[PDB]
Amino acid sequence: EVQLVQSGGGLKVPGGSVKVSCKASSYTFTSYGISWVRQAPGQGLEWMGDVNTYAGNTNYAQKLQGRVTMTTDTGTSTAYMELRSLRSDDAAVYYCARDRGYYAFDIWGQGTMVTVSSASTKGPSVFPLAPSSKSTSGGTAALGCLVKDYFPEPVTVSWNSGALTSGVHTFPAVLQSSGLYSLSSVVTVPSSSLGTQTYICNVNHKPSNTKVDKKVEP
Amino acid sequence: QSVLTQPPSASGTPGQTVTLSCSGSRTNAGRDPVSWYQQLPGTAPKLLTSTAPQGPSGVPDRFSGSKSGTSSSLAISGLQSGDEADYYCTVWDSVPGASVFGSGTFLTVTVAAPSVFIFPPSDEQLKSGTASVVCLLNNFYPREAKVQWKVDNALQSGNSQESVTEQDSKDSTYSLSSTLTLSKADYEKHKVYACEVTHQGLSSPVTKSFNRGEC
Amino acid sequence: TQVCTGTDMKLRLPASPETHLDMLRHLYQGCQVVQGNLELTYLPTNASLSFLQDIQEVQGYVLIAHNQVRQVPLQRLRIVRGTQLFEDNYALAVLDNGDPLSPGGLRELQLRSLTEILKGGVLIQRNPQLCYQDTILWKDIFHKNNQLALTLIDTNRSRACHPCSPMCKGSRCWGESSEDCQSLTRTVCAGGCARCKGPLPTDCCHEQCAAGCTGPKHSDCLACLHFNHSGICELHCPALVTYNTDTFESMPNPEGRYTFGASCVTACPYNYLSTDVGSCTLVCPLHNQEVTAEDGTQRCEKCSKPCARVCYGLGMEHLREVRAVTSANIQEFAGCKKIFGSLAFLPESFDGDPASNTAPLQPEQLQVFETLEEITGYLYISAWPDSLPDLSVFQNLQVIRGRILHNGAYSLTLQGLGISWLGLRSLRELGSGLALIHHNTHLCFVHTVPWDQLFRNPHQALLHTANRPEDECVGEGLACHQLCARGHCWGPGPTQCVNCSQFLRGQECVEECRVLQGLPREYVNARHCLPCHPECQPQNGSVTCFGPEADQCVA
């Protein structure tokens, strides 16, 4: 099985650099090119540049010129995404790919994790989202705990110390323009336990070791 | 050299014959630059057809693309259960050459009308400088929905961030999390905060709202 | 057979490994002199290298890298003339034959015969089992006027070496044994003496001699500084013509010879171009045509007229540094009856350089080469468009001489394709080199081909693997046609025969020639069927024509 494997999957502060790796295997490395392509969250593809394996030549696209250097490594077989002067905009996923054939990109390294934001470590404050008369569609009521402004990823949420997993929907973290993330984590219950059952959310931000519990009530 | 995908979303039930589009912005080659991809959630995109009407090896025969003038058209015989993905095309003509804004399909297993709720921002975040009114949609299909704000009957723009769950393991429906973010100096101004939810499963844009102060 | 030819694949990993060893064992098994880069790389440990065991000379460099054998039997290795050198420095380099993280890895050089290193330095690094490589007085090896006396050597190992041989004078040795002892021949010698067989003067070797001797004569020499003139290591093979010193008419000199690389021969060997000026080559000197001579020879004579136009392939002239055929050079080859150089089709042949708006090569374009008969270089394919089921745009390709060879060794390579049969019908000669045919999943009618008659020399052989299993090949039914003689074909039907059973009617084999019954009566000629002249009345059963032209018929 032919392969591309990628590394460097990390975090970065605006105005720094990273040089993603791409060890290509199981094929004559030199007789295909190698290309890179990027993918921010929610949006789609965007092409970086070229790199004739055989002889170096390149074609870094307009949006990135002078900010990009791409390099072969025939001896060891690897291609390198040397990216510069980055910022919040340049947070995405950086896949590497060849182009066998017959024309597009076929084989794909998993892509790598590249996010930019200038923040140290920071826990979130957990403010609940209380049910009443506006969240009852039928006999089902919804109650939650709004977890906002933390750094870095990840964060793990449990309801009522774990017992309540059904109905639980923990949306992925939406990175605020402010430089931090934010989430929401609800639970759909029959609207007959509001008071009978005790409703609390147990959050876990390991990088800050904060452990918040937030009772939810009308 | 460039393209546009319509729609950014088409839906599909089994056995059906499907179509996705792409509009080449110049008499491309020639013919045979174009190629379509499949994107599984959180994994690497892979090529499906290229030279328009030619599968590679490891991509099945219910796949087969095409072209006509300056437009390409992917085709699926009978859809199946794994085909939950976003689909991208490319006119690989000259350089630099462009991608597309992505036609993404989903598996319609009985459309579910969204469960539309509304939540005023808690009384502690409010005295903590900032505010957040979340408008939860629960268990719906497809992922295609329309979520907007009408802070006292005036449409909002830019002061909000959406979010959508990974397709449920057992029922094949999602859940959406709109979150308008404002300040303490602005929320005390308005009173009404509406969230009109138009969806290809509701007969008409269902609308909810709460009264600031009225608990 | 004394003389073999180098490889030229450097440190680049062998395309088909499962073949690679069997490539080496063919190249040199029988070989003494080696005009050029002896390269022995990547070899694993279960690998009997008993074919090098004969090699004396090596004109090139001697590269040894990334192997794994604990030992390479290059024991008779007299002299290595560093004509071309590895990295343009080292007339020998032993690199990373250690292990890819008791153990394996090259352990002893055992070069117990390497007297002279005519040019270039030495470079022996990173071989963590290798001993006694510093322990050589490298300065006795290098030639006197070696102004490339540079050396870099790694001594780091994970292994602790043993003492040399007791039976070794100095601590100097190639190997732990006593025959493995460095035997010096320059420093320990008597005066001006370049090379000698002992401290004594009478022990001095000839000047024309060059790597020691067993005597004072040129006909007592262990090697030659210029040319082995039939046993008499000389300066100059006698040229083909002698001068009166006075007048200057020069009738030919019967006992003149031909400089073959390092030799002095009367008749330049197979693929080689004998010359006016007395050499043997694979490129005629400037302002020469390559004629086909009053015997059978290729030969290189002058050009009265400004010489007639001539086709060029990859690795020749303006195409020299070009590597593949693309849309933007494919047209040069139109009309070409004989391409000087080589053609190669890599997968970038078939998706062009969009970086340079170079269109991909379309399968109708190849329909240029049907005009081509003789390639003087190599042929290398790795992509061919999915459609065209066979390599038949070369249907008229008659001979491949391989005076360039891909990766040093291969005159015709074919890998990673998807053709369903070959189709070179007209291909009779594989002048030199090995044919490598691997990894074509649908390739049948390979076995069906009688390679042994294309080939020209004993060192030659077709090696192949990962193809379409030739038992599953009668499994779908594919096999030569009845009109294909001796069971031999290049593909289905009687176009792709190799020799017609009975006669040829154009490109198609047939049972017989219309001398008696067919729609137009024909006449047979070189077992070809050809028409008589249309106005030579149809005979109610008997013979009608008697020849192609207008007269020889009936009425």
Tab-separated table of N, CA, C and O in Angstrom, chain A residues 2-6 20-37 47-61 68-74 76-82 94-100 103-110, chain B residues 92, chain C residues 323 348 351-355:
chain	number	residue	atom	x	y	z
A	2	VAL	N	0.707	2.075	-1.032
A	2	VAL	CA	1.442	3.324	-1.142
A	2	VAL	C	0.968	4.300	-0.075
A	2	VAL	O	-0.208	4.305	0.281
A	3	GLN	N	1.869	5.134	0.430
A	3	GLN	CA	1.524	5.987	1.565
A	3	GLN	C	2.169	7.369	1.596
A	3	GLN	O	3.227	7.607	1.022
A	4	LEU	N	1.497	8.274	2.288
A	4	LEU	CA	2.063	9.554	2.653
A	4	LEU	C	1.741	9.714	4.128
A	4	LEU	O	0.594	9.524	4.532
A	5	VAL	N	2.747	10.030	4.937
A	5	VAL	CA	2.522	10.245	6.366
A	5	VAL	C	3.004	11.631	6.785
A	5	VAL	O	4.081	12.073	6.380
A	6	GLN	N	2.203	12.316	7.595
A	6	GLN	CA	2.467	13.717	7.905
A	6	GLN	C	2.621	14.006	9.394
A	6	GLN	O	1.947	13.412	10.236
A	20	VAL	N	6.009	21.381	7.928
A	20	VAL	CA	5.326	20.090	7.907
A	20	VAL	C	6.105	19.039	7.109
A	20	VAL	O	6.684	19.328	6.056
A	21	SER	N	6.116	17.816	7.628
A	21	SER	CA	6.788	16.700	6.972
A	21	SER	C	5.814	15.818	6.179
A	21	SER	O	4.603	15.831	6.419
A	22	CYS	N	6.351	15.051	5.236
A	22	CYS	CA	5.531	14.199	4.381
A	22	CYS	C	6.350	13.048	3.797
A	22	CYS	O	6.790	13.101	2.646
A	23	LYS	N	6.564	12.014	4.601
A	23	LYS	CA	7.362	10.876	4.166
A	23	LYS	C	6.560	9.995	3.230
A	23	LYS	O	5.618	9.327	3.654
A	24	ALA	N	6.934	10.013	1.953
A	24	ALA	CA	6.243	9.237	0.923
A	24	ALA	C	6.895	7.874	0.697
A	24	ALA	O	8.107	7.782	0.537
A	25	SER	N	6.086	6.822	0.664
A	25	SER	CA	6.614	5.467	0.576
A	25	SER	C	5.935	4.602	-0.498
A	25	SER	O	4.898	4.972	-1.049
A	26	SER	N	6.539	3.453	-0.795
A	26	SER	CA	5.934	2.451	-1.656
A	26	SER	C	5.747	2.853	-3.105
A	26	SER	O	4.878	2.320	-3.791
A	27	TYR	N	6.551	3.795	-3.574
A	27	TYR	CA	6.493	4.220	-4.968
A	27	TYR	C	7.749	5.007	-5.293
A	27	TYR	O	8.322	5.648	-4.408
A	28	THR	N	8.196	4.953	-6.542
A	28	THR	CA	9.371	5.726	-6.919
A	28	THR	C	9.089	7.217	-6.676
A	28	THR	O	8.463	7.896	-7.492
A	29	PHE	N	9.535	7.693	-5.517
A	29	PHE	CA	9.312	9.061	-5.067
A	29	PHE	C	9.609	10.109	-6.143
A	29	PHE	O	8.875	11.084	-6.282
A	30	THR	N	10.667	9.899	-6.916
A	30	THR	CA	11.153	10.935	-7.818
A	30	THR	C	10.331	11.110	-9.084
A	30	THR	O	10.379	12.170	-9.707
A	31	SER	N	9.583	10.079	-9.469
A	31	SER	CA	8.892	10.097	-10.758
A	31	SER	C	7.431	10.537	-10.699
A	31	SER	O	6.703	10.392	-11.680
A	32	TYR	N	7.005	11.051	-9.548
A	32	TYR	CA	5.768	11.824	-9.448
A	32	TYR	C	6.138	13.123	-8.775
A	32	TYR	O	7.147	13.189	-8.100
A	33	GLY	N	5.316	14.150	-8.932
A	33	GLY	CA	5.483	15.351	-8.142
A	33	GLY	C	5.078	15.093	-6.703
A	33	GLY	O	5.099	13.956	-6.240
A	34	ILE	N	4.730	16.161	-5.994
A	34	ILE	CA	4.115	16.086	-4.672
A	34	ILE	C	3.482	17.442	-4.435
A	34	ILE	O	4.121	18.460	-4.695
A	35	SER	N	2.227	17.472	-3.985
A	35	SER	CA	1.549	18.747	-3.729
A	35	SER	C	0.867	18.846	-2.370
A	35	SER	O	0.523	17.837	-1.753
A	36	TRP	N	0.666	20.086	-1.931
A	36	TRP	CA	0.041	20.382	-0.652
A	36	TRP	C	-1.244	21.177	-0.868
A	36	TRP	O	-1.357	21.930	-1.837
A	37	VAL	N	-2.200	21.015	0.046
A	37	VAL	CA	-3.526	21.628	-0.059
A	37	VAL	C	-4.112	21.840	1.339
A	37	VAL	O	-3.958	20.980	2.209
A	47	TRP	N	-5.437	25.221	-2.772
A	47	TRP	CA	-4.164	24.638	-3.182
A	47	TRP	C	-2.938	25.487	-2.824
A	47	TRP	O	-2.899	26.687	-3.088
A	48	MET	N	-1.941	24.839	-2.223
A	48	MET	CA	-0.714	25.499	-1.784
A	48	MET	C	0.293	25.706	-2.918
A	48	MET	O	0.480	26.825	-3.396
A	49	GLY	N	0.953	24.628	-3.330
A	49	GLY	CA	1.958	24.702	-4.379
A	49	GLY	C	2.340	23.359	-4.979
A	49	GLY	O	1.781	22.322	-4.622
A	50	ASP	N	3.312	23.319	-5.914
A	50	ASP	CA	3.794	22.080	-6.617
A	50	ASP	C	5.124	21.617	-6.027
A	50	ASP	O	5.416	22.039	-4.936
A	51	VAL	N	5.917	20.795	-6.737
A	51	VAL	CA	7.243	20.360	-6.289
A	51	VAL	C	7.871	19.181	-7.051
A	51	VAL	O	8.130	18.130	-6.534
A	52	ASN	N	8.156	19.344	-8.306
A	52	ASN	CA	8.648	18.193	-9.043
A	52	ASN	C	9.656	17.477	-8.179
A	52	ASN	O	10.676	18.046	-7.821
A	53	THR	N	9.346	16.244	-7.813
A	53	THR	CA	10.253	15.466	-6.998
A	53	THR	C	11.621	15.454	-7.644
A	53	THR	O	12.634	15.738	-7.003
A	54	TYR	N	11.632	15.166	-8.934
A	54	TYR	CA	12.870	14.964	-9.662
A	54	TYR	C	13.839	16.144	-9.616
A	54	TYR	O	15.052	15.940	-9.570
A	55	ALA	N	13.321	17.368	-9.633
A	55	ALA	CA	14.203	18.523	-9.807
A	55	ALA	C	13.782	19.841	-9.167
A	55	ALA	O	14.171	20.910	-9.630
A	56	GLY	N	12.996	19.760	-8.105
A	56	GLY	CA	12.808	20.895	-7.226
A	56	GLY	C	11.768	21.923	-7.615
A	56	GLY	O	11.092	22.444	-6.729
A	57	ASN	N	11.650	22.216	-8.913
A	57	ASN	CA	10.799	23.306	-9.416
A	57	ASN	C	9.473	23.438	-8.684
A	57	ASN	O	8.889	22.441	-8.251
A	58	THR	N	8.988	24.665	-8.553
A	58	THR	CA	7.838	24.902	-7.692
A	58	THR	C	6.767	25.824	-8.277
A	58	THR	O	6.989	26.496	-9.285
A	59	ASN	N	5.599	25.833	-7.646
A	59	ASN	CA	4.528	26.728	-8.054
A	59	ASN	C	3.603	27.058	-6.904
A	59	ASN	O	2.415	26.742	-6.940
A	60	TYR	N	4.160	27.692	-5.879
A	60	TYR	CA	3.375	28.142	-4.739
A	60	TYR	C	2.339	29.170	-5.210
A	60	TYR	O	2.689	30.158	-5.856
A	61	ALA	N	1.069	28.944	-4.882
A	61	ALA	CA	-0.002	29.818	-5.360
A	61	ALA	C	0.129	31.268	-4.876
A	61	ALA	O	0.939	31.574	-3.998
A	68	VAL	N	6.136	30.784	1.569
A	68	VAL	CA	6.163	29.337	1.421
A	68	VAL	C	7.433	28.866	0.735
A	68	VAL	O	7.874	29.465	-0.245
A	69	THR	N	8.028	27.802	1.268
A	69	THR	CA	9.119	27.102	0.600
A	69	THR	C	8.868	25.600	0.658
A	69	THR	O	8.661	25.034	1.734
A	70	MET	N	8.873	24.952	-0.498
A	70	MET	CA	8.644	23.518	-0.517
A	70	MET	C	9.869	22.789	-1.041
A	70	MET	O	10.486	23.212	-2.017
A	71	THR	N	10.222	21.699	-0.366
A	71	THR	CA	11.517	21.059	-0.562
A	71	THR	C	11.421	19.535	-0.664
A	71	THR	O	10.751	18.892	0.149
A	72	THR	N	12.101	18.957	-1.653
A	72	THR	CA	12.207	17.503	-1.747
A	72	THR	C	13.332	17.016	-0.859
A	72	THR	O	14.131	17.806	-0.361
A	73	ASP	N	13.385	15.706	-0.666
A	73	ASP	CA	14.461	15.083	0.082
A	73	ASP	C	14.704	13.692	-0.477
A	73	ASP	O	14.467	12.694	0.203
A	74	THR	N	15.181	13.646	-1.717
A	74	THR	CA	15.317	12.401	-2.467
A	74	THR	C	15.947	11.284	-1.652
A	74	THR	O	15.419	10.175	-1.591
A	76	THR	N	16.135	10.524	1.386
A	76	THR	CA	15.362	9.920	2.458
A	76	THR	C	13.901	9.781	2.079
A	76	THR	O	13.159	9.049	2.735
A	77	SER	N	13.503	10.504	1.033
A	77	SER	CA	12.127	10.514	0.529
A	77	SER	C	11.135	11.225	1.451
A	77	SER	O	10.383	10.579	2.186
A	78	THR	N	11.138	12.555	1.401
A	78	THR	CA	10.199	13.363	2.175
A	78	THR	C	10.014	14.733	1.535
A	78	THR	O	10.948	15.279	0.950
A	79	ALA	N	8.810	15.283	1.640
A	79	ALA	CA	8.546	16.636	1.157
A	79	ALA	C	8.155	17.548	2.313
A	79	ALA	O	7.521	17.107	3.271
A	80	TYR	N	8.523	18.823	2.224
A	80	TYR	CA	8.433	19.702	3.387
A	80	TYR	C	7.722	21.015	3.123
A	80	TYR	O	8.074	21.749	2.201
A	81	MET	N	6.739	21.312	3.964
A	81	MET	CA	5.956	22.531	3.845
A	81	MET	C	6.522	23.626	4.743
A	81	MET	O	6.073	23.792	5.871
A	82	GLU	N	7.489	24.387	4.245
A	82	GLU	CA	8.095	25.436	5.059
A	82	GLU	C	7.300	26.738	4.954
A	82	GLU	O	7.524	27.541	4.053
A	94	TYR	N	-3.096	20.718	6.535
A	94	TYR	CA	-2.190	20.741	5.397
A	94	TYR	C	-1.846	19.348	4.898
A	94	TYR	O	-0.912	18.714	5.381
A	95	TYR	N	-2.630	18.880	3.932
A	95	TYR	CA	-2.425	17.571	3.327
A	95	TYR	C	-1.277	17.615	2.329
A	95	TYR	O	-0.951	18.668	1.795
A	96	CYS	N	-0.665	16.467	2.078
A	96	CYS	CA	0.293	16.343	0.991
A	96	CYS	C	-0.223	15.280	0.026
A	96	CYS	O	-0.913	14.351	0.439
A	97	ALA	N	0.097	15.410	-1.257
A	97	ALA	CA	-0.445	14.489	-2.247
A	97	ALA	C	0.379	14.450	-3.527
A	97	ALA	O	1.007	15.443	-3.893
A	98	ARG	N	0.377	13.306	-4.211
A	98	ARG	CA	1.036	13.216	-5.509
A	98	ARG	C	0.017	13.517	-6.596
A	98	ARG	O	-0.984	14.178	-6.320
A	99	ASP	N	0.262	13.034	-7.819
A	99	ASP	CA	-0.680	13.211	-8.937
A	99	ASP	C	-0.579	12.176	-10.073
A	99	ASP	O	-0.524	12.550	-11.246
A	100	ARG	N	-0.577	10.890	-9.717
A	100	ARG	CA	-0.418	9.798	-10.679
A	100	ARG	C	-1.399	9.905	-11.818
A	100	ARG	O	-2.586	10.126	-11.585
A	103	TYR	N	-4.953	13.431	-14.526
A	103	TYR	CA	-4.678	14.638	-13.703
A	103	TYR	C	-5.544	15.220	-12.553
A	103	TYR	O	-6.453	16.013	-12.796
A	104	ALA	N	-5.163	14.893	-11.312
A	104	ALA	CA	-5.558	15.620	-10.087
A	104	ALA	C	-4.580	15.262	-8.967
A	104	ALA	O	-3.390	15.254	-9.203
A	105	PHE	N	-5.064	14.970	-7.758
A	105	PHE	CA	-4.209	14.376	-6.706
A	105	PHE	C	-4.836	13.099	-6.166
A	105	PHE	O	-5.949	13.147	-5.647
A	106	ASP	N	-4.123	11.976	-6.207
A	106	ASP	CA	-4.735	10.708	-5.779
A	106	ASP	C	-4.475	10.261	-4.333
A	106	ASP	O	-5.419	10.116	-3.551
A	107	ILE	N	-3.216	10.017	-3.980
A	107	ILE	CA	-2.911	9.527	-2.637
A	107	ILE	C	-2.754	10.669	-1.646
A	107	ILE	O	-2.217	11.722	-1.980
A	108	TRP	N	-3.242	10.463	-0.429
A	108	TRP	CA	-3.331	11.551	0.534
A	108	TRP	C	-2.840	11.187	1.924
A	108	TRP	O	-3.414	10.329	2.595
A	109	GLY	N	-1.777	11.850	2.358
A	109	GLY	CA	-1.396	11.790	3.750
A	109	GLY	C	-2.575	12.275	4.566
A	109	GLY	O	-3.368	13.086	4.090
A	110	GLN	N	-2.691	11.777	5.791
A	110	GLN	CA	-3.804	12.115	6.677
A	110	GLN	C	-4.064	13.619	6.816
A	110	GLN	O	-5.137	14.030	7.257
B	92	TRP	N	-8.271	20.929	-13.500
B	92	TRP	CA	-6.817	20.909	-13.545
B	92	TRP	C	-6.298	21.171	-14.954
B	92	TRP	O	-5.767	20.282	-15.631
C	323	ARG	N	14.363	13.936	-19.939
C	323	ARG	CA	14.258	12.564	-19.446
C	323	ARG	C	13.105	11.738	-20.041
C	323	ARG	O	13.292	10.566	-20.379
C	348	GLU	N	4.788	11.024	-15.916
C	348	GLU	CA	4.637	12.451	-16.182
C	348	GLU	C	4.616	12.730	-17.686
C	348	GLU	O	4.296	13.837	-18.123
C	351	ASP	N	0.627	12.799	-17.596
C	351	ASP	CA	-0.001	14.038	-17.136
C	351	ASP	C	1.006	15.172	-17.104
C	351	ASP	O	1.871	15.225	-16.237
C	352	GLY	N	0.888	16.075	-18.071
C	352	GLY	CA	1.917	17.062	-18.338
C	352	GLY	C	2.214	17.990	-17.183
C	352	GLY	O	1.656	17.867	-16.099
C	353	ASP	N	3.116	18.924	-17.429
C	353	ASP	CA	3.501	19.890	-16.425
C	353	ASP	C	2.544	21.072	-16.477
C	353	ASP	O	2.699	21.963	-17.316
C	354	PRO	N	1.550	21.093	-15.578
C	354	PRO	CA	0.590	22.196	-15.596
C	354	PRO	C	1.300	23.450	-15.117
C	354	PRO	O	0.870	24.565	-15.402
C	355	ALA	N	2.393	23.245	-14.389
C	355	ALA	CA	3.286	24.312	-13.992
C	355	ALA	C	3.844	24.990	-15.240
C	355	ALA	O	4.232	26.156	-15.208
